[PDB]
Amino acid sequence: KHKISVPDVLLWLVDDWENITKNQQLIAIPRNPTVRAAIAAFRESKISHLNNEIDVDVFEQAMAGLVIYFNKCLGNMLLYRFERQQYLEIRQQYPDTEMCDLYGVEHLIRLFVSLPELIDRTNMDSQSIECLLNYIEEFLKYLVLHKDEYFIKEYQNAPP
Amino acid sequence: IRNVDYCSACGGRGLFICCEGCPCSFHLSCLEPPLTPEN
Numbered sequence A: 001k002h003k004i005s006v007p008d009v010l011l012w013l014v015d016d017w018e019n020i021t022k023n024q025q026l027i028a029i030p031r032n033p034t035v036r037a038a039i040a041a042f043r044e045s046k047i048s049h050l051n052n053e054i055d056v057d058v059f060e061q062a063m064a065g066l067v068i069y070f071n072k073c074l075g076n077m078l079l080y081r082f083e084r085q086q087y088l089e090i091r092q093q094y095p096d097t098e099m100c101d102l103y104g105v106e107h108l109i110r111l112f113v114s115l116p117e118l119i120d121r122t123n124m125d126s127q128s129i130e131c132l133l134n135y136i137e138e139f140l141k142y143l144v145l146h147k148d149e150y151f152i153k154e155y156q157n158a159p160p
Numbered sequence B: 001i002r003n004v005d006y007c008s009a010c011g012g013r014g015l016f017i018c019c020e021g022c023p024c025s026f027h028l029s030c031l032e033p034p035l036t037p038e039n
């Protein structure tokens, strides 16, 4: 409804802010692993622990909605505007692949960090927002648990 | 109908696609079709 708990390692996000904008750099965005390959990991991580039918149904609904939701948002309001011309660069390479399978989970966590300010634009009920923010913060924790192969380690200082 | 100079999506400058219903002029790259003059 108003609050998340970003664990004090993703010191990364604001760094992400600097390079793309001030210390001019870029992320070339054919990526492996992709968003879709990590949700389908955390799902398989946690869904082995949920007990009742209610829990597994709501988890499945949220995850499917999340792949589709990252799809529909990734274009219009998830890029720093320097990864914008390069977005046009990549939009000509792959024309037959959905946006939910070309980016690593570093844009997804931008969604995770900006979600509550978006649930404060809709008239959801307390349990919808409660379970939603619970799941995404658990995802942030799982990501900081495995950031070896998930986050990038270098930046692509590229031409305009 | 006076389209404001700066971008409607980020705040930059350049040539943008005009809009009559609203003086909103987004960058040709700041839409959600990512397109050059293609379309």
Ligand SMILES: [Zn+2]
Residues within 6 Å of the ligand: B019, B021, B022, B023, B024
């Ligand atoms: Zn408008």
Ligand SMILES: [Zn+2]
Residues within 6 Å of the ligand: B007, B008, B009, B010, B011, B012, B026, B027, B028, B029, B030
């Ligand atoms: Zn723009």
